[PDB]
Amino acid sequence: TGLRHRLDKVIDQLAIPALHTTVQYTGPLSVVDTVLANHAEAVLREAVSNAVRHANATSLAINVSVEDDVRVEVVDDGVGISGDITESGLRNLRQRADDAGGEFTVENMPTGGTLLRWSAPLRL
Amino acid sequence: TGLRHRLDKVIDQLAIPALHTTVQYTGPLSVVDTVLANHAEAVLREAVSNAVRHANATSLAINVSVEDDVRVEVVDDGVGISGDITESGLRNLRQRADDAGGEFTVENMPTGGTLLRWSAPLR
Ligand SMILES: [Cl-]
Ligand SMILES: [Cl-]
């Protein structure tokens, strides 16, 4: 079952007329493999469920795309004494992610070291 | 203008010779516009400075790429604490992002509502 079909089943189950709902798919969704498609499904289910539950909401906009991003990933074998990033370091990369329409994660890895990932779409 | 060698300057001023460093550039980095190139440079600088400040670090692996990601974006104009930002909400997002080798952000938007974005590479 294609990714789009799977995500639309989730939307069909959860969307309600009280939130005016728009869904836009762009890009080659058909090439997404089953494991990744499954993760996207789980995420959308959470995001749509929580939107519908969000007090006094009147609208819901869903955009799912496969598109070129820039990605910066940095892995080191150390861990920061005071957290995975300084306060103003988190602020900076988070603000840039927000500005770029992208996403940012930093973590102390389950079995040692630090991972940082930052991605944003090539276009807007 | 040349993005690979520009990001090398960031790495060279911080990582070398302090850390055993690997660097990979994948995809058409020449198509990255000036604004996004500036973000990538600033992110790398922060990420590399952070790694170098870790007392027990000996090694560093850098990957900068242009490649296809799946992106799921969901925006609503509801009020109060979104389910997305609760302990269990964030846990599920973080787990899936980690499993997929991706990333996510949840914003409460100052002007009202909640934005969620989750992305991960196709490969
Ligand atoms: Cl599809
Ligand atoms: Cl190129």
Question: Which backbone phi and psi does A46 adopt, to 5 degrees?
Answer: -60, -50
Preceding peptide of B17 cis, ω within 30°: yes
DSSP per residue over A2-13, as a string? -HHHHHHHHHHH
Q: How many beta carbons lie within 10 A of that of residue A24, not counting itself?
A: 10
Interface mutation vs chain A, best among B43, B91, B92, B116, most A CBs within 10 Å = B43
Residue B4 near residue B62, CB atoms below 8 Å:
no
Please name the method used to determine this structure: X-ray
What does the DSSP 8-state code read for residue B60? Answer: E
Residue B113 near residue B84, CB atoms below 8 Å:
no
Residue A40 CB contacts under 8 Å (≥ 6 apart), including other chains: A3, A7, A32, A64, B70, B72, B118, B120
Resolution in A: 1.9
What is the distance between the alpha carbons of residues B115 and B106, in angstroms, rounded to a whole number?
6
A64: which 2 tokens? 């799912």
List of domains in chain A:
1-124 (3.30.565.10)
Q: How many beta carbons lie within 10 A of that of residue B85, not counting itself?
A: 15
Which residue from A minimizes the CA distance to B51?
A: A76
What is the distance between the alpha carbons of residues A86 and A92, in angstroms, rounded to a whole number?
10
Q: Are strands A103-108 and A20-26 parallel, antiparallel or unpaired?
A: unpaired
Interface mutation vs chain A, best among B36, B64, B103, most A CBs within 10 Å = B103
Rg of chain A taking only CA atoms, in angstroms: 17
Residue A5 exposed, middle or buried by CB count within 10 Å (0-12, 13-18, 19+)? exposed
Residue A66 near residue A27, CB atoms below 8 Å:
yes
Residue type, A62: I
Residue B6 near residue B41, CB atoms below 8 Å:
yes
Closest CA to A11 of A55, A56, A47: A47
Look at A29 and B70 and tell me if their CB atoms are within 8 Å. Answer: yes
Look at A36 and B120 and tell me if their CB atoms are within 8 Å. Answer: yes
Q: Are strands A114-121 and A59-76 parallel, antiparallel or unpaired?
A: antiparallel
Residue A64 CB contacts under 8 Å (≥ 6 apart), including other chains: A3, A4, A7, A23, A24, A25, A29, A40, A44, B70, B71, B72, B73
What does the DSSP 8-state code read for residue A122? Answer: S
